[PDB]
Scaffold this active site. Structure first.
Site, PDB file in Angstrom:
ATOM      1  N   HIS A 162       0.192   1.961 -12.719  1.00  0.00           N
ATOM      2  CA  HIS A 162      -0.419   1.006 -11.794  1.00  0.00           C
ATOM      3  C   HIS A 162      -1.586   0.290 -12.459  1.00  0.00           C
ATOM      4  O   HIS A 162      -1.690  -0.943 -12.413  1.00  0.00           O
ATOM      5  CB  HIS A 162      -0.900   1.754 -10.545  1.00  0.00           C
ATOM      6  CG  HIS A 162      -1.686   0.917  -9.574  1.00  0.00           C
ATOM      7  ND1 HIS A 162      -1.207   0.598  -8.323  1.00  0.00           N
ATOM      8  CD2 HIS A 162      -2.929   0.382  -9.651  1.00  0.00           C
ATOM      9  CE1 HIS A 162      -2.112  -0.122  -7.679  1.00  0.00           C
ATOM     10  NE2 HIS A 162      -3.162  -0.271  -8.465  1.00  0.00           N
ATOM     11  N   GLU A 163      -2.467   1.050 -13.106  1.00  0.00           N
ATOM     12  CA  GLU A 163      -3.635   0.431 -13.718  1.00  0.00           C
ATOM     13  C   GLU A 163      -3.247  -0.446 -14.899  1.00  0.00           C
ATOM     14  O   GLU A 163      -3.766  -1.563 -15.048  1.00  0.00           O
ATOM     15  CB  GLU A 163      -4.655   1.494 -14.140  1.00  0.00           C
ATOM     16  CG  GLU A 163      -5.069   2.501 -13.048  1.00  0.00           C
ATOM     17  CD  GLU A 163      -5.628   1.874 -11.767  1.00  0.00           C
ATOM     18  OE1 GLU A 163      -5.838   0.649 -11.680  1.00  0.00           O
ATOM     19  OE2 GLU A 163      -5.869   2.654 -10.819  1.00  0.00           O
TER      20      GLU A 163
ATOM     21  N   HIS B 253      -2.057  -3.845 -13.932  1.00  0.00           N
ATOM     22  CA  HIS B 253      -3.065  -4.868 -13.642  1.00  0.00           C
ATOM     23  C   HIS B 253      -3.363  -5.712 -14.872  1.00  0.00           C
ATOM     24  O   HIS B 253      -3.632  -6.919 -14.760  1.00  0.00           O
ATOM     25  CB  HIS B 253      -4.357  -4.219 -13.140  1.00  0.00           C
ATOM     26  CG  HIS B 253      -4.333  -3.829 -11.692  1.00  0.00           C
ATOM     27  ND1 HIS B 253      -4.007  -4.715 -10.686  1.00  0.00           N
ATOM     28  CD2 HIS B 253      -4.630  -2.659 -11.083  1.00  0.00           C
ATOM     29  CE1 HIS B 253      -4.092  -4.100  -9.519  1.00  0.00           C
ATOM     30  NE2 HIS B 253      -4.473  -2.853  -9.731  1.00  0.00           N
TER      31      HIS B 253
ATOM     32  N   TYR C  19      -7.698 -11.508  -7.046  1.00  0.00           N
ATOM     33  CA  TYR C  19      -7.754 -10.190  -6.407  1.00  0.00           C
ATOM     34  C   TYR C  19      -8.395 -10.263  -5.020  1.00  0.00           C
ATOM     35  O   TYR C  19      -9.412  -9.630  -4.739  1.00  0.00           O
ATOM     36  CB  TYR C  19      -8.475  -9.194  -7.306  1.00  0.00           C
ATOM     37  CG  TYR C  19      -8.126  -7.755  -7.012  1.00  0.00           C
ATOM     38  CD1 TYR C  19      -6.864  -7.256  -7.313  1.00  0.00           C
ATOM     39  CD2 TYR C  19      -9.054  -6.895  -6.438  1.00  0.00           C
ATOM     40  CE1 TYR C  19      -6.529  -5.931  -7.059  1.00  0.00           C
ATOM     41  CE2 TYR C  19      -8.729  -5.565  -6.180  1.00  0.00           C
ATOM     42  CZ  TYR C  19      -7.463  -5.097  -6.490  1.00  0.00           C
ATOM     43  OH  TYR C  19      -7.133  -3.781  -6.234  1.00  0.00           O
TER      44      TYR C  19
ATOM     45  N   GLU D 130      -1.768  -5.997  -6.061  1.00  0.00           N
ATOM     46  CA  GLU D 130      -1.689  -4.561  -5.829  1.00  0.00           C
ATOM     47  C   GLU D 130      -0.248  -4.089  -5.739  1.00  0.00           C
ATOM     48  O   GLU D 130       0.114  -3.047  -6.311  1.00  0.00           O
ATOM     49  CB  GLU D 130      -2.425  -4.228  -4.534  1.00  0.00           C
ATOM     50  CG  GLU D 130      -3.871  -3.868  -4.766  1.00  0.00           C
ATOM     51  CD  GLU D 130      -3.992  -2.710  -5.725  1.00  0.00           C
ATOM     52  OE1 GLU D 130      -4.686  -2.859  -6.752  1.00  0.00           O
ATOM     53  OE2 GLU D 130      -3.377  -1.661  -5.461  1.00  0.00           O
TER      54      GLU D 130
ATOM     55  N   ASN E 271       9.407  13.814 -11.708  1.00  0.00           N
ATOM     56  CA  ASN E 271       9.505  14.019 -10.260  1.00  0.00           C
ATOM     57  C   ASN E 271       9.283  12.689  -9.549  1.00  0.00           C
ATOM     58  O   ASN E 271       8.287  12.508  -8.844  1.00  0.00           O
ATOM     59  CB  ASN E 271       8.474  15.047  -9.790  1.00  0.00           C
ATOM     60  CG  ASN E 271       8.566  16.353 -10.548  1.00  0.00           C
ATOM     61  OD1 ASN E 271       9.617  16.985 -10.579  1.00  0.00           O
ATOM     62  ND2 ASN E 271       7.464  16.758 -11.171  1.00  0.00           N
TER      63      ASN E 271
ATOM     64  N   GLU F 296       6.335   7.104  -3.484  1.00  0.00           N
ATOM     65  CA  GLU F 296       4.962   7.306  -3.044  1.00  0.00           C
ATOM     66  C   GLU F 296       4.007   7.041  -4.201  1.00  0.00           C
ATOM     67  O   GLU F 296       4.392   7.084  -5.370  1.00  0.00           O
ATOM     68  CB  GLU F 296       4.774   8.737  -2.532  1.00  0.00           C
ATOM     69  CG  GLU F 296       5.861   9.189  -1.573  1.00  0.00           C
ATOM     70  CD  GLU F 296       5.643   8.640  -0.188  1.00  0.00           C
ATOM     71  OE1 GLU F 296       4.586   8.942   0.403  1.00  0.00           O
ATOM     72  OE2 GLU F 296       6.523   7.903   0.302  1.00  0.00           O
TER      73      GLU F 296
ATOM     74  N   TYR G 190      -3.554  13.419  -5.536  1.00  0.00           N
ATOM     75  CA  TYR G 190      -4.239  13.256  -4.259  1.00  0.00           C
ATOM     76  C   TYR G 190      -4.255  14.577  -3.501  1.00  0.00           C
ATOM     77  O   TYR G 190      -3.228  15.258  -3.411  1.00  0.00           O
ATOM     78  CB  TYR G 190      -3.504  12.197  -3.436  1.00  0.00           C
ATOM     79  CG  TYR G 190      -4.185  11.787  -2.149  1.00  0.00           C
ATOM     80  CD1 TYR G 190      -5.488  11.310  -2.154  1.00  0.00           C
ATOM     81  CD2 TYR G 190      -3.519  11.871  -0.931  1.00  0.00           C
ATOM     82  CE1 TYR G 190      -6.118  10.929  -0.978  1.00  0.00           C
ATOM     83  CE2 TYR G 190      -4.139  11.494   0.249  1.00  0.00           C
ATOM     84  CZ  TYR G 190      -5.436  11.020   0.217  1.00  0.00           C
ATOM     85  OH  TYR G 190      -6.061  10.647   1.385  1.00  0.00           O
ATOM     86  N   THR G 191      -5.429  14.930  -2.943  1.00  0.00           N
ATOM     87  CA  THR G 191      -5.653  16.081  -2.067  1.00  0.00           C
ATOM     88  C   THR G 191      -4.928  17.345  -2.516  1.00  0.00           C
ATOM     89  O   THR G 191      -3.885  17.705  -1.952  1.00  0.00           O
ATOM     90  CB  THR G 191      -5.288  15.745  -0.622  1.00  0.00           C
ATOM     91  OG1 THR G 191      -3.946  15.250  -0.572  1.00  0.00           O
ATOM     92  CG2 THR G 191      -6.242  14.703  -0.076  1.00  0.00           C
TER      93      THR G 191
ATOM     94  N   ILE H  20      -3.632  19.712   0.256  1.00  0.00           N
ATOM     95  CA  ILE H  20      -2.676  19.238   1.254  1.00  0.00           C
ATOM     96  C   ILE H  20      -1.378  18.876   0.546  1.00  0.00           C
ATOM     97  O   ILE H  20      -1.358  17.974  -0.298  1.00  0.00           O
ATOM     98  CB  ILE H  20      -3.212  18.014   2.015  1.00  0.00           C
ATOM     99  CG1 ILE H  20      -4.548  18.334   2.681  1.00  0.00           C
ATOM    100  CG2 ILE H  20      -2.177  17.504   3.022  1.00  0.00           C
ATOM    101  CD1 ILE H  20      -5.243  17.105   3.233  1.00  0.00           C
TER     102      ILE H  20
ATOM    103  N   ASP I   6       1.533  14.765   0.915  1.00  0.00           N
ATOM    104  CA  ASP I   6       0.924  13.474   1.202  1.00  0.00           C
ATOM    105  C   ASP I   6       0.780  12.637  -0.071  1.00  0.00           C
ATOM    106  O   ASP I   6       1.144  13.049  -1.174  1.00  0.00           O
ATOM    107  CB  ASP I   6      -0.407  13.647   1.938  1.00  0.00           C
ATOM    108  CG  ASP I   6      -1.453  14.377   1.106  1.00  0.00           C
ATOM    109  OD1 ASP I   6      -1.115  14.923   0.033  1.00  0.00           O
ATOM    110  OD2 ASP I   6      -2.627  14.393   1.527  1.00  0.00           O
TER     111      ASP I   6
ATOM    112  N   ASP J 106     -11.937  -4.387   1.720  1.00  0.00           N
ATOM    113  CA  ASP J 106     -10.939  -4.164   0.675  1.00  0.00           C
ATOM    114  C   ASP J 106     -10.451  -5.495   0.096  1.00  0.00           C
ATOM    115  O   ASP J 106      -9.257  -5.707  -0.119  1.00  0.00           O
ATOM    116  CB  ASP J 106      -9.798  -3.308   1.238  1.00  0.00           C
ATOM    117  CG  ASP J 106      -8.768  -2.914   0.205  1.00  0.00           C
ATOM    118  OD1 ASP J 106      -9.113  -2.768  -0.982  1.00  0.00           O
ATOM    119  OD2 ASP J 106      -7.593  -2.759   0.603  1.00  0.00           O
TER     120      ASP J 106
ATOM    121  N   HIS K 104      -5.187  -3.423  -0.751  1.00  0.00           N
ATOM    122  CA  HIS K 104      -4.503  -2.137  -0.770  1.00  0.00           C
ATOM    123  C   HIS K 104      -3.839  -1.808   0.557  1.00  0.00           C
ATOM    124  O   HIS K 104      -3.270  -0.715   0.693  1.00  0.00           O
ATOM    125  CB  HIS K 104      -5.479  -0.995  -1.102  1.00  0.00           C
ATOM    126  CG  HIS K 104      -6.096  -1.093  -2.464  1.00  0.00           C
ATOM    127  ND1 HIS K 104      -7.299  -1.728  -2.691  1.00  0.00           N
ATOM    128  CD2 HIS K 104      -5.685  -0.624  -3.666  1.00  0.00           C
ATOM    129  CE1 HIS K 104      -7.596  -1.655  -3.979  1.00  0.00           C
ATOM    130  NE2 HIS K 104      -6.634  -0.987  -4.592  1.00  0.00           N
TER     131      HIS K 104
HETATM  132 CA   LIG Z   1      -2.004  16.242  -1.721  1.00  0.00          CA
HETATM  133 CA   LIG Z   2       4.811   8.544  -7.136  1.00  0.00          CA
HETATM  134 CA   LIG Z   3       6.257  11.861  -8.020  1.00  0.00          CA
HETATM  135 ZN   LIG Z   4      -4.719  -1.470  -8.202  1.00  0.00          ZN
END
Ligand SMILES: [Ca+2]
Ligand SMILES: [Ca+2]
Ligand SMILES: [Ca+2]
Ligand SMILES: [Zn+2]
Ligand SMILES: [Ca+2]
Length: 316
Positions: A142-143, A146, A157, A166, A183, A187, A193-194, A197, A200, A226, A231
């Site tokens: 993603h970065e 850009h 932007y 984005e 994998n 998403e 992330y988290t 959890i 997510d 934003d 985003h």
């Molecule tokens: Ca998580």
């Molecule tokens: Ca992914």
């Molecule tokens: Ca993945």
């Molecule tokens: Zn971005």
């Protein structure tokens, strides 16, 4: 630096072992000479001065906890370089093999990563919202995307052009994730992330509404946060791209999927041949239709599917 190309070994943020291309000159540096004019990874040392110091290691083994974000920033930058070269015949982000620079350990507890106009930058996360963000291949790609956008369409932007910017980074971040084929999913950021959890992520391209993002133009955000929702409204374009690739029926509108490779070809061509700094969503639709027409012909299923997908998200 000047030295000889070497191959080190280390563990990334998620504990996976991988070889990395290094350079030996007294120390072993995270400098991969096998790709273009080099991939260089730096230590920001918990500060915000950039780029920091080119990452030096005494023994070419990168198994310390402190090494893990650097291992992944370096390795996943290589994967992303390979994707653009092998899939789109694009040599680095400028198309002329520009050196790719990344800094890790940026700031303290920094819950983000970014392209700053010259290089990629990765926080370590605070351990609750994020673990070190270079652990996500989709994040790294993603970065770096850009940078591709900066050198090509140049989408400003902010507002709709920024939401396209984005979405382009989410689309190619995901296509790189599939290209590595570990994998892969639709998403964004699930690997970093988290940590407390399961299940997510930051955003979903298959169902942007799962995380509060719009999946139809009638639900677009029009406020000022934003950068005008770059985003947030990206979910409208992310959903269209997901539909082009995978198909589905969305708000009653059926889309025949054409697969990830054709999605990538269509959007890469739109990005590099038709989009401009001020393109809005309606202009992206036209750019994607024209790209699909160039590649597959005006009567093709591919063109028909692009139209269905933008219809489904309310973009004419
Ligand atoms: Ca998580
Ligand atoms: Ca992914
Ligand atoms: Ca993945
Ligand atoms: Zn971005
Ligand atoms: Ca070492």
């Amino acid at each position: 630096i000047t030295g000889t190309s070497t191959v080190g070994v280390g563990r990334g943020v998620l504990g996976d072992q991988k070889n990395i291309n290094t350079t030996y000159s007294t120390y072993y540096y995270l400098q991969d000479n096998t790709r273009g004019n080099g991939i260089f990874t730096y230590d920001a040392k918990y500060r915000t001065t950039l780029p920091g110091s080119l990452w030096a290691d005494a023994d070419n083994q990168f198994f310390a906890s402190y090494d893990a974000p650097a291992v992944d920033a370096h390795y996943y930058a290589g994967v992303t370089y390979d994707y653009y070269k092998n899939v789109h015949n694009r040599l680095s982000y400028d198309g002329n093999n520009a050196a790719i620079r990344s800094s890790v350990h940026y700031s303290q507890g920094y819950n983000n990563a970014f392209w700053n106009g010259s290089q990629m930058v990765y926080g370590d996360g605070d351990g609750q919202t994020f673990i070190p963000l270079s652990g996500g291949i989709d994040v790294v790609a993603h970065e770096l995307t850009h940078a591709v956008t900066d050198y090509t369409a140049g989408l400003i932007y902010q507002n709709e052009s920024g939401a396209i910017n984005e979405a382009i980074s989410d689309i190619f971040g995901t296509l790189v994730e599939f290209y590595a084929n570990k994998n892969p999913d639709w998403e964004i950021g699930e690997d970093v992330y988290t940590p407390g959890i399961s299940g997510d992520s930051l955003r979903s391209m298959s169902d942007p509404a799962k995380y509060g993002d719009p999946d139809h133009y009638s639900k677009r955000y029009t406020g000022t946060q934003d950068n005008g929702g770059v985003h947030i409204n990206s979910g409208i374009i992310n959903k269209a791209a997901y539909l082009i690739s995978q198909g589905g029926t969305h708000y009653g509108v059926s889309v025949v999927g054409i697969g990830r490779d054709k999605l990538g070809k269509i959007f890469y061509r739109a990005l590099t041949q038709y989009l401009t700094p001020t393109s809005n969503f309606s202009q992206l639709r036209a750019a994607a239709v024209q790209s699909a027409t160039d590649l597959y012909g005006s009567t093709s299923q591919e063109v028909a599917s692009v139209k269905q997908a933008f219809d489904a998200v309310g973009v004419k």
